[PDB]
Amino acid sequence: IKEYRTIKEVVGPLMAVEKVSGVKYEELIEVRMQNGEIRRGQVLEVQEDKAMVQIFEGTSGINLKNSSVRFLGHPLQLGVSEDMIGRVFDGLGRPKDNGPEILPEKYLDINGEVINPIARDYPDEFIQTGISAIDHLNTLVRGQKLPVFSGSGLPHKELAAQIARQATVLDSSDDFAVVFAAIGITFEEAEFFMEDFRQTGAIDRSVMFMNLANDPAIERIATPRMALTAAEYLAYEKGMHVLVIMTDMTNYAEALREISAARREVPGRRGYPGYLYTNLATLFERAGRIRGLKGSVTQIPILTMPEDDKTHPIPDLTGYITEGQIILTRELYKSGIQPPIDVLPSLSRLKDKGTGAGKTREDHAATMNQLFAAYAQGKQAKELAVVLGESALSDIDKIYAKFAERFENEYVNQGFYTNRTITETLDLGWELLAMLPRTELKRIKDDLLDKYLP
Amino acid sequence: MIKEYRTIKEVVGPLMAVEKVSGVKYEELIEVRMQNGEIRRGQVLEVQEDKAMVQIFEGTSGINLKNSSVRFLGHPLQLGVSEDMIGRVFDGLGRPKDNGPEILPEKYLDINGEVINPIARDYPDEFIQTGISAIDHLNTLVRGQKLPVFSGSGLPHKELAAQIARQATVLDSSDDFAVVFAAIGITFEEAEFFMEDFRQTGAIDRSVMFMNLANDPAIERIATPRMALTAAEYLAYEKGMHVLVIMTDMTNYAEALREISAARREVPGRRGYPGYLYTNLATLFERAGRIRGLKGSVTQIPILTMPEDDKTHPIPDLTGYITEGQIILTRELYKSGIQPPIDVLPSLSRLKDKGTGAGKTREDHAATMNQLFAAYAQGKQAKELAVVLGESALSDIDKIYAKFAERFENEYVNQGFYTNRTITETLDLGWELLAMLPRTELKRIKDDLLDKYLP
Amino acid sequence: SSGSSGMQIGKIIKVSGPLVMAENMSEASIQDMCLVGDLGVIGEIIEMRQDVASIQVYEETSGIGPGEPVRSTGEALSVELGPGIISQMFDGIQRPLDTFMEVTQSNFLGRGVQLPALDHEKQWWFEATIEEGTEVSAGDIIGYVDETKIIQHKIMVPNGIKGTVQKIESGSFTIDDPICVIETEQGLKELTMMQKWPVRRGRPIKQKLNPDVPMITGQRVIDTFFPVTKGGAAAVPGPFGAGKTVVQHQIAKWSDVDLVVYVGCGERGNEMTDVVNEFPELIDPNTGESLMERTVLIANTSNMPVAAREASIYTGITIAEYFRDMGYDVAIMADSTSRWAEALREMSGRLEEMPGDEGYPAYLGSRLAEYYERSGRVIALGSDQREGSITAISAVSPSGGDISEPVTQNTLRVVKVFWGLDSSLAQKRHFPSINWIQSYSLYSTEVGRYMDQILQQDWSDMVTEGMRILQEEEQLNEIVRLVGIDSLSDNDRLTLEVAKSIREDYLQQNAFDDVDTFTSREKQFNMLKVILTFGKEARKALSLGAYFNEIMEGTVAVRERISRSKYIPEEELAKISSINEEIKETIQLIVS
Amino acid sequence: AEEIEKTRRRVNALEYMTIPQLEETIYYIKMKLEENERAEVTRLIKVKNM
């Protein structure tokens, strides 16, 4: 192996090694400090007999003359095994649950490879999350990139954990896993997840990668890549249906912003890296499903919109990548709605592939369009009511406003520990459409109405 | 003699480094000849010791450094001038594009030219009838003037130029303008507009044109408006002709400068533009006017699209500080169906004084415009208050101005691109529109002048 | 060296991201393509200091370092043009992803795998049409290959070739086989069915022409109010979820063009997979053949190498020029051009260049201006002087929807059509989300004339009146929100309900409805006439002294028929125009 | 009664048009100089590193 004792200079977190050969871009290294301590690092650029590296833990306390640098001859990898299920890891795949060590089947670059667009297979299958607002109006599809746009204080933690345990695939697939990824979150936030997973037995079905706020910024941006690499392994090599949840994606961008500045890279729009869109796409496009392969990867990235600004670089660029969005509003959180999902700005782009007979029952698409149209009219009539009093309303505007009320309190508000099957969701939807006269349900043909409408 | 070196050190973008040279001068015109045999012209930007940096106009695609050589022509970038240029169209570097016969050039003139000595420069006072009333009467244009058009992308500035170009004739004379047109980075359709319009007004036989389109190298845009202005000052001074200079897009010129500036790693000014933008722009616009003893004239009407529709942007800002006024277009007027959409309030002419009065116009010409200004300024603002607080929230005299302000825009400003108003008709219409006001309110017109011309 | 001579081999001296520095590249030129590193990843030389070349790599460089060899290819970024290009999915640098998959035996995109764009093995039947001993210039057609039943692939004389046909004959060949011998001044030159061309240099033409013929997209809002001509260019700036991709898919599906070249520039991979699946199953009734037999797909997704985004743009437009020279009307879609500009900014920072606006390089506008200027109505080279065109549709993706973005602005300074998507409308489920107020087309005037002739109706005046109502609606609504609708005149309230009819019954158009996704030119006329005649009769009724509420309450029947009129089949247009009869008879009873 | 409507119009026009146009403008103005400030700061570092 290669062990070099010559370090030209150390500046900040960046280190310079001279008299080097056979070193590559993004190659991994190990620093043998004078006190025996071993710190990991990464090659940022290499030219001639010189290589510029960045240390994860930092360069603090290093004596150059008595420290050595070893080049491992491989990029940042992940030891994969089927025994990863039920286990808990850190941002770099190192175990954390203090259980037995894992002998990896093999090692994989966490960068992975890009799926051939030809070889791609359109999502086209339903996933039951349990949450009615999603499973019906903003359906999650196998291989879809469906994110959650939240805010500070908002119960996106409770929503993620709920989906993590409630989400299953119908058709009785004995193989369905959840890869939960935590990015730069506080200690207690991490404990919340790990405790809820164990007590609900969801840990036995999940693989967890936990990264903290005090953790190195590089570890924070490598955490989702460790998670996805496990997912792609479990799905494309072990044929499982893998659901990947990542949060907080805002912490990912702030870390990416820190590292960029650490490497003297010029800021882009609003201070965030000019390659932010591209960098996020290297994460979110890892999802999808491939032709001729059992198994798939579905992602649910959860982020907090800074000052609830959806035009902020983080939620905006995400929306330019993902196949929809689940919007949480504190206006509904104040109302106590659990989960506080506003179905008006929320959207799924591939839901039509997930609805319909065979995957769901036959009235899915019809009730979806009707529940939305009536709610939008109900909410609008409600707003027109408040500004002009309850006198300015028509006879139908009143029942429509009253409709939207039950829609938020009974339909959407289910509870963070209530699992509604898709059948229970759809049946409940009809009991709300019964509030409206049959003549108003223009979005539904009569054959469906004669069959399901009370 | 000929002077040629085969020692190219670097080729980075539009810039090229030639070393081990000797006897090279600043701004010297060069010619790169590639290994295939292709000739690409260039200009020296900086020469130190045995080294020299050059900018290549046609670009540096497919150049092999070792097998290519660089010829030093021993003279700056210059234009071959002639009387035969009239009726011809050249490229961005003055090369024939019309398939016309080979021109026997009269002289070779450095396109940078020279600064007109103020003592020799005599004042422009000859009123020009443009046919457009918003220009002729309210923001007067004289010959020898540098009066630009401030427009935006999508706005019809090409029509306003084309209208002026053919409706241009000075009173008290039979002098027909011999225009010169510089196309800078514009598109085919925008160029063909001027082109076709010239062919059926017959002004193509009375003009010389310099074409640099969007498919043409951006570095050629640095020279193009100088090729035009040099040919302008040649025909106007040496040959005593009356030349009208039209340049568009002027914005695309400043874009080209910033491309070279960013390539040279120069210290950037506002919006990345060179710190010497004001000076370089001035070396173009100042190249206009009249001089003692010489009958000819060079009058200049540049066109620039304001980025962001922002008047405070560097390009329209610096231009406004240099030129003698400006003509401004607005989307609000353009959407209202006003032709031409000229917002008369932020526009300006700096030579309207000595320009009009008794002898060249009617004596009311000075008092009418100043009255129309104050009236429109009050009327338009009243209309703003009207559409939000109601017409019944104005006073009786406010509604009189508000009604006047609207009628001002629809007939005085809006006249159509193919209608020619003589200065008389405009003045007559001027009183008609301001007639609908009490005499007591107009405190800016001579009372003896009122009675005589008041309807 | 060691007794034997070989080609010049470079040596990597520096690697950082998509930028590789290599020494000993003396014989290489700028813009030349090269194989970088041991794997031989594709890369383009962009700069040169001494013998050191700065290389722009179109693939991932992770795992590459100094010491590795670099071999040049000699020629620049070029495309293979000939039989086998139709109905294909290419990546940024024109590699068949179909073939890419089978060769590597992998569902994933590896690197160091170079592949011929076209099938050199496949037997094509060439049919000569020119006579021997004929003076053929550049562009002149020598024969053809029926690549598809729909599209005829004409074999033209390659540029820089002028001479005399010596030996030509029909038969089954490959694109490597000589099919014609042209006797030139230099001697004899063999011509095959395939030619190549540098993507960065536009293909030569005789001259440009004014685009005066409007394109039929089947989208009511576009073809009527903001039309685009064949050869014109249109920009579609809008926030995410507004419908940039959907709009571009509609043009690819229904536009009256001969060929469609779709470019997936740095966007979603599923959006390209959605096309290669659905398009071969979309057959127009006349030909018998599918839509995939007229399209050429280029797909460089977001997670695919950033540098290859620019290549994808230039690859597609060059292919579009190739069929343009065949006299065909082509339409190219770029989705999205923003990702292209983002690619330029990435390489700019790596090259330590200076801004520039918003991080983008100073030459951004030029690259854009150069791109759109390659489209338009042209006269292809050749004695035929045949006419072809390229219509450029480009989706701009402004950050946060703000169109003050440099990419949107620079595009608007060279295109005459602007389809502005509104996020507010998209949330109201108002698709296409085109803002009818801010959007514009500088072709509308000329299109109106062409429309007035080809239909014998006053189309231009109908459109003018239609837009005039929509503008009053914007002003009236402002009066509404601070005074109240009840304070409006009955003539004003009529103007509102007519404007409402324009938005919901004409402008709103579901692309996913099998009958509403397309609306023929003649169908658009009837629909607009019906809507306009309702306003005229109601205006007359109000003049007679009728009340607004009476007219509205006595028109529930027709106004619903007007609403559902968009769903009336293309054969039963007589049912739409007959509403005019039912309208004129309904309001006259209201007066009485 | 007539004057109520006039005052009602002014309140409505002031609350719905004037004030929100002010707030949204100062934000877009604040964002501009926020970007302009640091867009220059980066350039200055380039000047510093010459």
Ligand SMILES: Nc1ncnc2c1ncn2[C@@H]1O[C@H](COP(=O)(O)OP(=O)(O)O)[C@@H](O)[C@H]1O
């Ligand atoms: N013309 C249209 N008709 C119906 N729905 C549309 C239309 N345009 C957009 N949509 C809806 O809006 C969503 C956004 O589509 P897309 O074009 O992918 O957005 P963008 O490309 O602007 O990000 C789609 O999922 C579709 O459901």
Ligand SMILES: [Mg+2]
């Ligand atoms: Mg899209």
